Symmetry: C3
Subunit: 308 residues, 3 copies
């Protein structure tokens, strides 16, 4: 079999993504019913930059599949410094059945996947956050049923990993995705083109706008994220002024559908991209969304392992 | 309805007796209780590393069938990247209990007010309640009933072990004496809570600078590292002091020991020392506490 | 009697063969042995981190049914805050074995003098005995019986791999040659221990600066990095002395036509070994890396049974 990897949301076809999301719902109901890693077999969970929350969901999820996660955090020498990335991948492939990697540039993930003989999963990268969006789609389906035809709007920095993955993963599910962002902070053109092509196959659409009011109107799902990642704190820009009109606050939420829900990948900077009232309010699904990282990532691993 | 264990008096006398009985049962049959089978997760978070505390909690959770997710001090501090309240809400979706080594008590209180799973103080600035459960297990297995015994702690009477031996000790019915120099005495709120609890159990609280009188007739003698050190040398737990205790007295020390400061080679390697059994019982007593908290939450 | 594994000759020739046979059995059936079911604990302690060593031990212990408790250098170094003997006595109450990566051999000896459970040297300044068990497992599966094979090691002849290939090699009956420049030769105590063990096994010890001669007719060619991190500030040019000992295609061509090449990794390609050799048909480095898992599990099973 071809080894399957999951480095970006569109690595799954629409039918494959539906299979993974249905498995996520099954695993939420019966969390120890799938044991492909019984043994235990190993899975590498490697952090070029620590993310303690990604650590909880993957370490526990792997264990609930019967496996043993070997967790490497940024205390270790960064992968590729002491030894070529290719050499490390060949050794890892002798010890583990899958490699979960949080890293920076997408080309590093691509390189690992080209040489490893086990599935490689992007746990979080500069360009994409596909496991978060699987958990988001699971959360939306829990609350609203069929995903096809829903309207989702994302607000804030339109070129970050969540904007890119909501575009790609959302249209793969048949969701009409809107990115509301200031000029200068718009989605990468190759990601946007990929999302537009995928939307053709599912009946979805891609919209990019600077009009936050228009993006909120009629939306079923509103999403935001922090405006600035750690790498961007020294980029020289004022990263508050451009985004203030895109804050997810009660006024924005009241423009959406009466049954709209609110998502946010965490961590949240309350008072910047989202207000306490919205985050702690009845439309917020952020805590269920965080829980579903555990279930959606287990489903993905089960699915990749059985295909590889 | 969620029970937490942040200080020794969080357990009533009757509840503490239940936990210590369970600790004895688990020492005999260490994999007979599997409330975390699955595995279910337990968070084990250190704001400052304590390797001894990691071993005992991590293995204990595994022997309950669970998986400990261990976060060492290297990682960004809990509460730096998001509110402790938001962290507690997310942790409560991934794990069945939160074991936390932090500094100030108000951080523990903040986590426990929000988390919907039990929170356990692994070790803090003000209290070390899990160590005192292990100490009480050790005393019981060597002397039987705890009620009425005399325990004396020597040295820094302001630290977490002095506070927890006062509260946990009087909760078990033990007459507790802290022997300490004048600048290093128990916190007055802790001392008062121990005096009140002592009225329920028949116990008592004494604080003195007279190490000789603290040692005379003691059944259990305890010390701890002293951290500038001249004030503690008269409270050194040495052979002279131990010679004053009741026959078959036992010496405890939470470790690590600095041999030649707070305790001598002769006392620590001698026949009264129960320091190695004490260390082993961190594993059993902490497992018992988790089983008990999980059942009531 | 508690059995420890601090240096390669801690096993007799017969005992080493038992461990290597077990390593082959565990490679075939990796979860058939569960001496640590429970789980029981095993301490895995790193005075200096080695992520690649952690993976093999942590997974191997789990596949024996146990739980590895890992301590790395972010914690207070063992010995600083209490005696090593006190720490050994407490660890012995929590775990069934102690795996330790540390520096001088006296530290390992101190731990093992008091521990009531097996102590295993995961990697130290003087020896790397678990790696050589994995090397011997690899040689055996590529060449068959070990007795009488000719193995040559190239590079820094005073490092942990040279010492362990000497001791573990002659324990298996292998004729071991160390090819190294003057000033970088095996420790005399280690060389003498290997010479004495070789008399029991029919093996031999050779130390030479003639890299050509060491490669000629060799069945196994081995190298390692020329510098450990603790040596970077030692004041020596640690490149020019070792260039003649590079494991390159010209050197490999001198060996037996069926020769294999070993390297404990990570490799610095272009220094001690070239891409052509690393990636060519004689290289066994990836199987070697895998066999760390199996050989270490076999060692643990064997020590636990005897302790
Ligand atoms: C994933 C990482 S990161 C590092 N310093 N080493 C490794 C590694 C792990 C297993 C095998 C080889 C290298
Ligand atoms: C292995 C290490 S490292 C450190 N600072 N303490 C310990 C330790 C662990 C368990 C018991 C006693 C000490």
């Amino acid at each position: 079999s071809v080894i399957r990897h999951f480095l970006r949301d569109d690595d799954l076809s629409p039918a494959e993504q539906a299979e993974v999301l249905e498995l996520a719902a099954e695993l939420k109901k019966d969390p120890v019913s799938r044991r492909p890693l019984q043994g235990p077999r190993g899975v590498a969970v490697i952090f070029d930059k620590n993310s303690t929350r990604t650590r909880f969901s993957f370490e526990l999820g792997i264990a609930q599949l019967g496996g043993h996660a070997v967790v490497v955090d940024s205390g270790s020498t960064q992968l590729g410094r002491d030894e070529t990335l290719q050499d490390t991948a060949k050794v890892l492939s002798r010890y583990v059945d899958a490699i979960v990697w949080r890293t920076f540039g997408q080309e590093r993930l691509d390189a690992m996947a080209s040489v490893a003989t086990v599935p490689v999963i992007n746990a979080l990268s500069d360009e994409f956050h596909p496991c978060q969006v699987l958990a988001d789609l699971q959360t939306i389906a829990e609350r609203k049923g069929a995903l096809r035809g829903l309207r989702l709007s994302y607000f804030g920095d339109g070129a970050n990993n969540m904007a890119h993955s909501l575009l790609l993963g959302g249209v793969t599910a048949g969701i009409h995705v809107t990115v509301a962002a200031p000029e200068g902070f718009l989605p990468d053109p190759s990601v946007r083109a990929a999302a537009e092509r995928r939307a053709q196959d599912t009946g979805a659409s891609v919209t990019v706008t600077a009009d936050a009011h228009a993006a909120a109107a009629g939306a079923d799902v509103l999403v935001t994220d922090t405006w600035t990642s750690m790498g961007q704190e020294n980029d020289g820009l004022d990263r508050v002024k451009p985004f203030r009109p895109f804050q997810l606050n009660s006024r924005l939420l009241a423009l959406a559908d009466s049954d709209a829900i609110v998502l946010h990948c965490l961590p949240a900077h309350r008072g910047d991209e989202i207000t306490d009232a919205v985050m702690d309010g009845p439309a917020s699904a952020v805590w269920d969304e965080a829980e579903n990282r555990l279930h959606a990532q287990k489903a993905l691993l089960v699915w990749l392992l059985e295909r590889s």
